[PDB]
Amino acid sequence: XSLFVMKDRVILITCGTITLLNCVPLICEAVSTVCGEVEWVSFMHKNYSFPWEQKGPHLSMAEEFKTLRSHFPSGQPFIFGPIDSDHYFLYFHSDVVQPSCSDDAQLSMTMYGLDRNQTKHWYSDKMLPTGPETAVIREATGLSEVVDDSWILHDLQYEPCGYSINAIRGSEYQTIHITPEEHCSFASYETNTCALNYSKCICGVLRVFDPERFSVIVFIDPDSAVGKSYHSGGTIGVEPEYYPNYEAHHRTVNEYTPGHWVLKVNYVKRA
Amino acid sequence: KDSLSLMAMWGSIARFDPSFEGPEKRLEVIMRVVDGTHVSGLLAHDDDVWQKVIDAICAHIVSREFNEYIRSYVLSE
Amino acid sequence: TRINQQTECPSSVHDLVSCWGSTDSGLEKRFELNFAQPVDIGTVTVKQLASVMERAGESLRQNSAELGIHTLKFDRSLLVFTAKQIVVRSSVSVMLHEAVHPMLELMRSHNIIVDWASFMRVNYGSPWDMTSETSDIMAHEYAELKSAFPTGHPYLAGPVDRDHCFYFVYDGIDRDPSSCRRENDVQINVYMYNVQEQQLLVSHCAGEYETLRVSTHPFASFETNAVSAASDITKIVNGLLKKFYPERVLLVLLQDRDAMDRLEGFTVVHRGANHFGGGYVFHQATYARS
Numbered sequence A: 001x002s003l004f005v006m007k008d009r010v011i012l013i014t015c016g017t018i019t020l021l022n023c024v025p026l027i028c029e030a031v032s033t034v035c036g037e038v039e040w041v042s043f044m045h046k047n048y049s050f051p052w053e054q055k056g057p058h059l060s061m062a063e064e065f066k067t068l069r070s071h072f073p074s075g076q077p078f079i080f081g082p083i084d085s086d087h088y089f090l091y092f093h094s095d096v097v098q099p100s101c102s103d104d105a106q107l108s109m110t111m112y113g114l115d116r117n118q119t120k121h122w123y124s125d126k127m128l129p130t131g132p133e134t135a136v137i138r139e140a141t142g143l144s145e146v147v148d149d150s151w152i153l154h155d156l157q158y159e160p161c162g163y164s165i166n167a168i169r170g171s172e173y174q175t176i177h178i179t180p181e182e183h184c185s186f187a188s189y190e191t192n193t194c195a196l197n198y199s200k201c202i203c204g205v206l207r208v209f210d211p212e213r214f215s216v217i218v219f220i221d222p223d224s225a226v227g228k229s230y231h232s233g234g235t236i237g238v239e240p241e242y243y244p245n246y247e248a249h250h251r252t253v254n255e256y257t258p259g260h261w262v263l264k265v266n267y268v269k270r271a
Numbered sequence B: 001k002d003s004l005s006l007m008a009m010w011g012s013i014a015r016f017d018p019s020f021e022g023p024e025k026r027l028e029v030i031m032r033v034v035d036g037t038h039v040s041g042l043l044a045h046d047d048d049v050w051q052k053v054i055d056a057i058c059a060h061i062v063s064r065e066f067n068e069y070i071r072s073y074v075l076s077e
Numbered sequence C: 001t002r003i004n005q006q007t008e009c010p011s012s013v014h015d016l017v018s019c020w021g022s023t024d025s026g027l028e029k030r031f032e033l034n035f036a037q038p039v040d041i042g043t044v045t046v047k048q049l050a051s052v053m054e055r056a057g058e059s060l061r062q063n064s065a066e067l068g069i070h071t072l073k074f075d076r077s078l079l080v081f082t083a084k085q086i087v088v089r090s091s092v093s094v095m096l097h098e099a100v101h102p103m104l105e106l107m108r109s110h111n112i113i114v115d116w117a118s119f120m121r122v123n124y125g126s127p128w129d130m131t132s133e134t135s136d137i138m139a140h141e142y143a144e145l146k147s148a149f150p151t152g153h154p155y156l157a158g159p160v161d162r163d164h165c166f167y168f169v170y171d172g173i174d175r176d177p178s179s180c181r182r183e184n185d186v187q188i189n190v191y192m193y194n195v196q197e198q199q200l201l202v203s204h205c206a207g208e209y210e211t212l213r214v215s216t217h218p219f220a221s222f223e224t225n226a227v228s229a230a231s232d233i234t235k236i237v238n239g240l241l242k243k244f245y246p247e248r249v250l251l252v253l254l255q256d257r258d259a260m261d262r263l264e265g266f267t268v269v270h271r272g273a274n275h276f277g278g279g280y281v282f283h284q285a286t287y288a289r290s
């Protein structure tokens, strides 16, 4: 995958073995043409399920670090969570010379071991852009509830399997990407929606997939709605109480840069 | 390879079973606005600009949707 | 300029290291075992603990016996042994991971069940500095630790390219309602980089201690498990910063299952927490002199 272009930023999401970092020079150029100045760059990815197949700088976190350091020398890498299990790698660069107001939001989900009754609908022997066929898939699986009529959506059913969808509503966006193969079942969800509590958003996604395990990472800005709630002892929708069928295995909290926080939680389904 | 990536590999090996890479890479760039910044920001560019960006990573756009705040593109290898 | 090499998956962590894998940049290593049941202070002898540390290249030089504590001092390491835990802290030239398996065998020979263990190193440099051996050592440390505790996991608290703690935690604590394994431990660690040589232990209560190691770029390392320390971390750190006056500081505070905002003249570099599934939390913050 997805490319979200906004007034003040770009968000490029890719999967497979695509060498994402190759497009940094052109993004920098795209900012200089309109007379902008890069102030904030983040590179992030859930740990790869098959790291030995990644190419270019992505074959190791040291290579991703060195590559990003060659362009953003002051950036800093982080690893959140168990390194030999579910975790996130983050590289963060910032050149904020003029203090501003940070009220954005970011909610990402990674899900594995998807419902077997659902994976049936993510298969297809032909390529299908957004049309009547995909509408059947969205209703047959439950994506219609996550992406209701108030969103502008456009999806793609892959051949032989694979599903992607992008949704937008005003300045907010929503994206999902599904890999339904039984032996490597995976699904992803991301959104920048403002919400005082993500439980219903998250549970809505879990109802579709009902995964064996999943991770949720939440970037909290100081001046956002969820930010004020989090910094006042309030629940934000990722606490264990909202997932009785799941057991929290590990959780991390990091102020990666002053005033900005990130929360990650790994959930494993109970027996 | 480095020890940290070595640990991450062993965790993936223990979950391996003889395979597409679902987990994604995410890049985000936010720019500052100056006096001479285009009033439309990055939205001033046409789809020509963003298509050349996707070419750098050896992908292509399959569909497009835009509104008054955001341009959305679906990509495929 | 790469090609694909169809090869076998290593069947063990040791095969992965040898096949797919300046001096060590860390400042201190720390190895800890906790027991499913408290251990008679005297059942494990000083001789047996010393033979374990011989596997890591350390020779016993001094040892003292106190109420609920046995202290063993080596050339580059300090070992504390109480009824609830064994904790050894050493310089980075000590291959402390070589004592993991022998130490576990010793516990095994005494019918002592280890249900929680940790291996921790405090680094100033990044493990991705290829001119250094830090990465090769950490890979060997991981081999021994993961080989002994397949259920354990490694973690990296803090910026990988700045002051941070890499630690490995195995949690096999039996938490069945009918279990008598309570978790109200205190652990507070203060690492002080570039201060302005000794290994000391001070005991104020039975089974509770304060240890201080000073070594080398001079650095001092303070640890305590005293319940009284958990009520006033602010006071003790200020006394340490005054006596040592370091450039950078790294704090670690344990919040056990049964239960740091600003330092004088120091700016916060990083702040974070690792909440383990077992309910306990490890809090960490790094600081740099203003």
Ligand SMILES: NC(=[NH2+])c1cccc(/C=N/N/C(N)=[NH+]/N=C/c2cccc(C(N)=[NH2+])c2)c1
Pocket (backbone or CB within 6 Å): A001, A002, A015, A158, A159, A160, A161, A162, A163, A164, A177, A178, A179, A180, A181, B020, B075, B076, B077
């Ligand atoms: N938007 C995206 N970039 C995206 C999002 C989510 C999943 C996928 C992958 N689909 N493909 C999957 N899940 N499995 N592999 C299918 C396959 C099998 C044999 C051959 C080929 C091929 N075209 N070479 C693909 C792609």
